[PDB]
Every structure is written in structure tokens, then in C-alpha cells.
Design a protein around this motif. Structure first.
Motif, PDB file in Angstrom:
ATOM      1  N   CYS A  10       0.827  -1.192   0.000  1.00  0.00           N
ATOM      2  CA  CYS A  10       0.000   0.000   0.000  1.00  0.00           C
ATOM      3  C   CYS A  10       0.867   1.250   0.000  1.00  0.00           C
ATOM      4  CB  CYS A  10      -0.986   0.011   1.170  1.00  0.00           C
ATOM      5  SG  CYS A  10      -2.418  -1.099   0.943  1.00  0.00           S
ATOM      6  N   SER A  13      -1.804   2.460  -4.834  1.00  0.00           N
ATOM      7  CA  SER A  13      -2.290   1.669  -5.956  1.00  0.00           C
ATOM      8  C   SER A  13      -1.836   2.294  -7.268  1.00  0.00           C
ATOM      9  CB  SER A  13      -3.811   1.566  -5.914  1.00  0.00           C
ATOM     10  OG  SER A  13      -4.244   1.049  -4.670  1.00  0.00           O
ATOM     11  N   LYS A  30      -4.381  -3.401  -7.063  1.00  0.00           N
ATOM     12  CA  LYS A  30      -4.812  -2.827  -5.794  1.00  0.00           C
ATOM     13  C   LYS A  30      -4.004  -3.455  -4.663  1.00  0.00           C
ATOM     14  CE  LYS A  30      -9.230  -2.125  -5.001  1.00  0.00           C
ATOM     15  NZ  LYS A  30     -10.662  -2.394  -4.692  1.00  0.00           N
ATOM     16  N   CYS A  31      -3.661  -2.670  -3.649  1.00  0.00           N
ATOM     17  CA  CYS A  31      -2.864  -3.188  -2.550  1.00  0.00           C
ATOM     18  C   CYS A  31      -3.747  -3.885  -1.516  1.00  0.00           C
ATOM     19  CB  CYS A  31      -2.021  -2.082  -1.902  1.00  0.00           C
ATOM     20  SG  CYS A  31      -2.965  -0.809  -0.997  1.00  0.00           S
ATOM     21  N   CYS A  36       0.544  -5.328  -3.680  1.00  0.00           N
ATOM     22  CA  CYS A  36      -0.242  -4.794  -4.781  1.00  0.00           C
ATOM     23  C   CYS A  36      -0.579  -5.896  -5.772  1.00  0.00           C
ATOM     24  CB  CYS A  36       0.492  -3.645  -5.473  1.00  0.00           C
ATOM     25  SG  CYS A  36       0.616  -2.144  -4.449  1.00  0.00           S
TER      26      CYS A  36
END
Length: 41
Positions: A10, A13, A30-31, A36
Motif C-alpha cells: 500500500c 495503488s 490494488k494493494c 499490490c
């Protein structure tokens, strides 16, 4: 493959978009799970 990829837990993203692009070919990620994750490509 992205060389600038160690642990982007994170970091962003949108930050991981480039690595994911350079990894899979698709800049969609997306984390989650402290990583990710890419939605596949």
C-alpha cells in the motif's frame, strides 16, 4: 517484470500501477494482503 518492486505494501495503488504494468502488461492493481495484487493479464 518490474525491477523496482520489493514490497509496495500500500505504497499507493496508482504507484503500483506502473510496476504491475511492467510485471504483467496490465497496469490494473490494488494493494491487498499487504501486496499490490494485479487483476490478471
Amino acid at each position: 517484470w518490474c525491477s523496482t518492486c520489493l514490497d509496495l505494501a500500500c505504497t499507493g495503488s496508482k504507484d503500483c500501477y506502473a510496476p504491475c504494468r511492467k510485471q504483467t502488461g496490465c497496469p490494473n492493481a490494488k494493494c491487498i494482503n499487504k501486496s499490490c495484487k494485479c487483476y490478471g493479464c
